[PDB]
Design a binder for this molecule. Structure first.
Ligand SMILES: CC(C)=CCC/C(C)=C/CC/C(C)=C/CC/C=C(\C)CC/C=C(\C)CCC=C(C)C
Ligand SMILES: [Cl-]
Length: 274
């Protein structure tokens, strides 16, 4: 069985009960430690109690060290706010928030020359917290638990410039952070408009991904818009990605929700090498 609330085996139920007993000392430090929450850690370690507990306790320390309880009120530095692409836009057919990643126009080198790695990673943590907050809001709105996210991963324009080694290493640090602190949060990731370079790029970051994450990555072909609309209502998808959603001013890219990156002006640079 699936290891989710309502659908646990006897062994899974027993493990959940022991797990809650075993980690009860840190539950007051945690956001809404309901069965759904605990089961994400258990599923991520195949209900191994020792490993699940180690994973959760490491997360507790992460939350303290990164001040996660207050990260939503932290606005990133100007260069990040203005040029770090992507954004939350719409909900899928099951009510899960959708996040757009826009790789092509991302100036990875400009970002690392203009911001600390710590602030870039902190910005990604904040995005994850914003997505989980949206899931909690959807849960209330829909009257059923929403705790996963759909990602549209736009690889149009993916190029050798993105595989600059310090960029790959920084991105791997984000991916490790994601896997260790947001287990069982990804529902599906649709790669769209991937060029021929994609398999090499994918191989560079595969070591940072869990098996669970890898199974949720779907690389789409020429009919990607049609596939997206099998999963998300058109009114929830930007015109740019095959739907009917626009900004209030009519812009088909929904730039009020999604950042489209761009090359970073030199006035933002803070260092000469990385
Ligand atoms: C530190 C940070 C996260 C951003 C700052 C700017 C930098 C250094 C960007 C790195 C450049 C970049 C985007 C590298 C990855 C390019 C795309 C691939 C290697 C394709 C395979 C990627 C996936 C299949 C995505 C998996 C993502 C999740 C959340 C599971
Ligand atoms: Cl080197």
């Amino acid at each position: 069985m699936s290891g989710r609330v309502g659908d646990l085996s006897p062994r899974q139920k027993e493990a959940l009960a022991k797990f809650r007993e075993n980690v009860q000392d840190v539950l007051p430090a945690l956001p809404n430690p309901d069965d759904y929450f605990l089961l994400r850690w258990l599923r991520a370690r195949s209900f191994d109690l020792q490993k699940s507990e180690a994973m959760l306790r490491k997360h507790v320390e992460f939350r303290k060290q990164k001040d996660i309880d207050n990260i939503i009120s932290w606005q990133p530095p100007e260069v990040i706010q203005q040029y770090l692409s992507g954004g939350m836009c719409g909900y899928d057919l099951d009510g899960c928030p959708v996040w757009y990643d826009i790789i092509g126009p991302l100036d990875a080198k400009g970002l690392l020359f203009s911001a600390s790695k710590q602030d870039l990673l902190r910005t990604k943590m904040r995005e994850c917290e914003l997505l989980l907050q949206e899931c909690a809001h959807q849960t209330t709105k829909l009257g059923r638990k929403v705790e996963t996210i759909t990602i549209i991963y736009d690889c149009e324009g993916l190029g050798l410039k993105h595989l600059w080694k310090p960029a790959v290493e920084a991105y791997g640090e984000f991916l490790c952070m994601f896997e260790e602190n947001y287990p069982e949060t990804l529902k599906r990731l649709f790669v769209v408009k991937a060029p021929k370079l994609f398999p090499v790029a994918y191989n560079l970051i595969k070591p940072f991904l869990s098996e669970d994450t890898r199974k949720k990555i779907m690389v789409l072909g020429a009919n990607w818009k049609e596939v997206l609309l099998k999963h998300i209502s058109p009114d929830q998808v930007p015109v740019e990605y095959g739907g009917t959603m626009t900004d209030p001013d009519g812009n088909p890219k929904c730039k009020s929700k999604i950042n489209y990156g761009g090359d970073i002006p030199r006035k933002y640079y803070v260092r000469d090498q990385v």
